[PDB]
Amino acid sequence: MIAPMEKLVLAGPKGRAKELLQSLQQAGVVHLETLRPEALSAYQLSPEERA
Amino acid sequence: SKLEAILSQEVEAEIQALLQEAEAKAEAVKREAEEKAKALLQARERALEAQYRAALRRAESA
C-alpha cells in the first residue's frame, strides 16, 4: 500500500527560513516543490550566499 | 495572525532602529552647523570690539 503522502506548507522569516530548512534537512523525510506562479517572486537567493 | 505579528513586530523594530539611526544622523548634521553659527557670531563680536577700541583711540587722538 502506497503511503497517502500529505502536503506540508510552511512560512515565516528568512533567517528562520535558513534555520528551519537546516532543521528540516537534518531530519530528511520531506520532498520539495517549486510553488512559483501565485503572488510571490521566484526567490533569487542572495549575492553573498551565491558566492 | 500569529506569524503576521512575528514578521511585523520584528522587522518593524528593525525599521524603527533605522529611523533612530536617521535621527542621530540629522542631529549630527545640526550640531556642527550650530557650532559654526556660534563661532561666526563670536568672531563678528570680536571684530566689532576691536573696531570700537580703534574708534576710541582715534577719538582720543583727535
Q: How would DSSP label each residue in chain B?
A: -HHHHHHHHHHHHHHHHHHHHHHHHHHHHHHHHHHHHHHHHHHHHHHHHHHHHHHHHHHHH-
Produce one character per residue of A2-25: b if its CB has 16 or more CB atoms within 10 Å, e if not: eeeeeeeeeeeeeeeeeeeeeeee
Cα B40 to chain centroid, rounded? 13
Question: φ and ψ at B11, to 5 degrees?
Answer: -85, -15
Residue position matching grid coordinates 566689532: B48
Q: What's the number of domains chain B is made of?
A: 1
For B23, the domain range is 1-62
Q: Across the interface, do B6 and A11 touch by the CB < 8 Å criterion? A: no
Q: How far is B41 from chain A (nearest CA, A)?
A: 51
Q: Which residues numbered 5-34 in A keep a CB inside 8 Å of some CB on B? A: 11-13
CATH number at residue B62: 1.20.5.620
Residues 4-43 of B with CB under 8 A from A: 6-7, 10-11
